[PDB]
Design a protein around this ligand. Structure first.
Ligand code: GLO
Ligand code: GLO
Ligand code: GLO
Ligand code: GLO
Ligand code: MG
Ligand code: MG
Ligand code: MG
Ligand code: MG
Ligand code: OH
Ligand code: OH
Ligand code: OH
Ligand code: OH
Lengths: 386, 386, 386, 386
């Protein structure tokens, strides 16, 4: 087959297969899953680990003894299966108190509470061995213009991230942060709407080396953006700390379909990029099995996430290893793209007449790039017609 | 009226009112405009200056004496009118040689030529007194995945920008660079697709202080993004070096409608932001009078750009100066957004029981944000119903 | 200013002001509203009527005796205020049994249950005085290709609507049906995604005269379509039976902002069309008070809906009434557009040398359309700068 | 592998391979192709026929004698290769006289000239054997609200199409007309923007049986709509007279990528629908070889169109033929979907206690639809992992 094993580093959040199907126009179609039950069936499917929001593991408003009790049972299922916890995050979007945001809520007291709720879950994550802590600011934003002064809201967002950075620094924790962008939903527009806005923001933080991004396929596609290109810019910057894989069919509400569904060619170019750049983190799936499905359809969907990644990995490796493709890449001058434009510097370039006054503009313009032949070769490989 | 005068700093490119109406499915509907003729009618409309692509002023492939001749006549119309040239740029997209890009073309020789063509126009811009040099990489991108390795293409883009930065440094020129983002068109996806991706890229340049962004209203809207929010993040970073104003009606081809058309409420929040943050650069219009129009419709459209900015400036100033609005802003706690979340630092925050263990979550959650009242106040002011 | 009266016939759904605020990523921020409180509060706001889904009025699962009690409570409040009930609809989307649809579910027994639930509410709506019954097939569709054969699903959809028409015909009821299109959400793709698809479908029912459309501003805008142009096509067809007004800020999840918010110029062009076409049905607002709001924010938002419709009505009447505008329209040849192209038939046209042989194409091509001056006059009227 | 033959009836427009590459921001990258070279080259590629706009074949402005010479040259090449001409159309969008439209221009004389230009090419198309004549009203629309009264424009559009039907009826021609929808570009909004709007319009013409639609993959996707679902509705209506195949990577400018590129899974679902519905018309490709390509890239791209259609045909036949799939379909109750909801009428339905009173809603709600396993089986077939 294309069978997962933990070496594939496939991970899933408790809230993915655990989604009960409650949406904006409909009630839950499935019962709540026990986290222990999820750890056991994911290990049987070939998964390497699980991730969690604090409120996915410990129900909101738990007493301290109830909390110890929930953390205990989960720690026990983990130990018995060999499953790891590579990443964790905080829910700063479900409770009504976060209706205007967490870190950038207009009310000062909710911002402080958002910070304490996050620090408590960071202590727990480190204990369970997580090395990345994600922040998805889903309620940071606005539906209307005067409701949020975005320059002041970015001051408060930077304040919170700097505060968390000094906190993990004083404790000597080995954990880093990853910002998860999303352009809209549940808010009209969300602050730091794309991988680019998140990367630019991090450069203004006090300790920038502590923070990176955790891009999600469907989010960048909700802005009509090219997800493989955004990932290539995060890898060029040395900031791809983690990644969430799923599917989306266009610019519409966030679907969280299983990976491979939605834009299939972009899932092929994404796998090709992650494998050839040697990304070594978790291949995390942040998807929601459709609410039409019962619990068997939930595990069939999660199995399909891992399967589609292993089929696409195989076809992309076969495409880059093919002699005919290597030759087509040379024909489209991808080798010359790797050459410096002007390693001898600006003074030699200005003195070079072949670069301007003697350049044959029309002879260069008539060279076809042979890109369509190359792309049909990539299509034959993806489709297994070679 | 709402009459422009040069104090308003309104500027226009030679290619805007000069557009002949040639589009992907149709030929030109208007004759070419003489640049001198454009300088004279813009000064009569109340404009402060004009901008240009090299090939808008000096037709491609001019001989050196033809070039001196074209630069002469234009310099003469400028002097006789008092019009300034605040900005200039290079056309690295119209000639067939640039069909795979300029700075990131796969062919090494075209990249060198792209750099020499740009340096020649930088010398001319400085002479005419321009203080900002724009780069719009419209052909930097791809329609297919293997045709452009984006990590290597970002190396070549950084190489070119660093080369231009050492060039203006050695010459002692007082000019800075501004990157103009666009998500797609004419290419399938364009590198540095949004204000965020451009800001993140600049932080990886050798002399980052030399570069900023020049956002265009319609471009960010072609990705469904909020343009006032993107401008607020460029102002927060200290990188809004210039701005292009126009209109767009949604996610579709780039329309370049006159400013005020398209999303009218976003043009209101944009003017409110630029005026209250005290932006001091040109209010440049990069628009195309519809090809249904004759030359009188061309000057009526350009006049409407300046008029809509002066009406929106008036209504936004009236909105922020209204006592009822100041009170509604206090009611929605925009004042508390300006307070530091935790100026006493993380140790006091962790010791503060009112922040977590004694926080009344439900009492805070029931506080309405009063945002709808605030936004109807902004709507009454925009519409002049107060 | 601008107060709503009775002949304006603004109406609101029980579910609009009654939205408690739970969305895909969060829980309710408001308590449930008793329908009689909504009838009273809306009567005091100047509303002329209320509409309802069956389950907004009678909780799902109610016994025939609890049903009777909720209905008696509701008709007392109507009786006491003089509020009308112009339209009603069925909830065939919330209960998990409708997870794959109502009328086009794959399970035959769920389809029969859908039709019995609908027929039961039709009888109720008729005695209350509603003359329009709406269908919004929100769950009719799929997230994947083989899950629904769309030709067979359109035979089931037609069969359902024909059975409904047979039933109102046998009972002698005066009621007409209106289909409300939506392109996606909660399903990946919904059947009859736009006004055009719903109009074309009606033409295939056995009694087409019983069916029309109930378009919603936001829904056509979720496909990036022009909502005023869609409504002109439904009015051209004789099928605008009802309309839902609200706002949407682009292609993204369905926002249901209050009327006037979102695309403000499309709202002016819509009110200009409806008022100049003499539409006489209800002006119904199907919107959701943002969950950031308490109940005072809910009534402020609902009042804002009516106010924005009246300001835009005044501004559009002023635009059409201005002699400079009526002159601008003649300059743009909108009067020549109402002349028949060739009222004397195709033989006359063929014989006419001035229509081809002797037509002066270049003179005709050089005529400007003067559309920009005409649109800036409309901009000055909407903004009250005229 | 996979070679095109004659009974596949792949056809191409003279304008597709003949695209010289000038786009809104750049000049031609290729020389013009002589039509007889295109007929010969396409015959050698395995194409069954060519289509044409009048001005692709006879340059605009030609004298009746130059016209005769281009037509004689073209019919010799067809005669010599055995290539057919299944469809033809009129260019009513390039010449500046059509800047405001053809059939719905505001100038009455341009509308009459539009109809004479069309009638002249209809006579030509009939003697060549075309049985479908396409209309793409690319300039019919507006960029602003008062520039076009859409109800009067639909009376002019209907008047034009009725005059065309009167003309083919009087001549006894066997030709049918097909409308090709497009939502926008080159106009801000185009009239009859989708398959649904065009279908609904046809129903209002005097002879509806003479008119159907010619949908294009990319155009429905520019509105974010599901192209397989639109085509199933046109087939349900009896109106899929012709179809244009290509690719589009999202909501943006009209790309016209080769067939298979863009949304690859929508292309599989389209070929599965067309082949299982037994569509018999041409498989026409209306695409543009990217301007990065020389002429060898143009023929590689055009061959790729046919190859992708044949691979997807094989993969969809294999999916429908697999017993595990046909079992999965029964598990998802696609067979219950083809059963009448209530073939014994509405009195039987009303009397049935098992349809409402005694219906076990919770048992029915708990049934899983098994749609994910069925879609991963379709994913494995498209990818040849089965
Ligand atoms: O759109 C929803 C987000 O992607 C959500 O599922 C986040 O992943 C989670 O809050 C942790 O990052
Ligand atoms: O979409 C087109 C671009 O906006 C173009 O008009 C640039 O403005 C110009 O090349 C200079 O920046
Ligand atoms: O997207 C939601 C629909 O618009 C819904 O609110 C309908 O209004 C209702 O079911 C009656 O048509
Ligand atoms: O957007 C462009 C249209 O698709 C055009 O290529 C039509 O195919 C042609 O005019 C016949 O309909
Ligand atoms: Mg998501
Ligand atoms: Mg632009
Ligand atoms: Mg809605
Ligand atoms: Mg097209
Ligand atoms: O998500
Ligand atoms: O532009
Ligand atoms: O809605
Ligand atoms: O096209």
């Amino acid at each position: 087959s294309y069978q997962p094993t933990p070496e594939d580093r496939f991970t899933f959040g408790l809230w993915t297969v655990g989604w009960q199907g409650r949406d904006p126009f409909g009630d839950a179609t499935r019962p709540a899953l026990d986290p222990v039950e999820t750890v056991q069936r994911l290990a049987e499917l070939g998964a390497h680990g699980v991730t969690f929001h604090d409120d996915d593991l410990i129900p909101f408003g738990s007493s301290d003894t109830e909390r110890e009790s929930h953390i205990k049972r989960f720690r026990q299922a983990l130990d018995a299966t060999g499953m790891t916890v590579p990443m964790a995050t905080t829910n700063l979007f479900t409770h009504p108190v976060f209706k205007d945001g967490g870190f950038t809520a207009n009310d000062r007291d909710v911002r402080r509470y958002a910070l304490r709720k996050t620090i408590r879950n960071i202590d727990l994550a480190v204990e369970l061995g997580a090395k990345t802590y994600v922040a998805w600011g889903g309620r940071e934003g606005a539906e209307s213009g005067a409701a949020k002064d975005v320059r002041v809201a970015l001051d408060r967002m930077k304040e919170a991230f700097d505060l968390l950075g000094e906190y993990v620094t004083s404790q000597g924790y080995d954990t880093r942060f990853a910002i998860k962008p999303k352009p809209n939903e549940p808010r009209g527009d969300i602050l730091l709407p794309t991988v680019g806005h998140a990367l630019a923001f991090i450069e203004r933080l006090e300790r920038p080396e502590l923070y990176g991004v955790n891009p999600e396929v469907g989010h960048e596609q909700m802005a009509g953006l090219n997800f493989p290109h955004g990932i290539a810019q995060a890898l060029w910057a040395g900031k791809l700390f983690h990644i969430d894989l799923n599917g989306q069919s266009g610019i519409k509400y966030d679907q969280d379909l299983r990976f491979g569904a939605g834009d299939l060619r972009a899932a092929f170019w994404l796998v090709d990029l992650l494998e050839s750049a040697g990304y070594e983190g978790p291949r995390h799936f942040d998807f929601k099995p459709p609410r039409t499905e019962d619990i068997d359809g939930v595990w069939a969907s999660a199995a399909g996430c891992m399967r589609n990644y292993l089929i696409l990995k195989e076809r992309a490796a076969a495409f880059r290893a093919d002699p005919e493709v290597q030759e087509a890449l040379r024909a489209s001058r991808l080798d010359e793209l790797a050459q410096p434009t002007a390693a001898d510097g600006v003074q030699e370039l200005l003195a070079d007449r072949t670069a301007f006054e003697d350049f044959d503009v029309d002879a260069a313009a008539a060279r076809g790039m042979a890109f369509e032949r190359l792309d049909q070769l990539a299509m034959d490989h993806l489709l297994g017609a070679r």
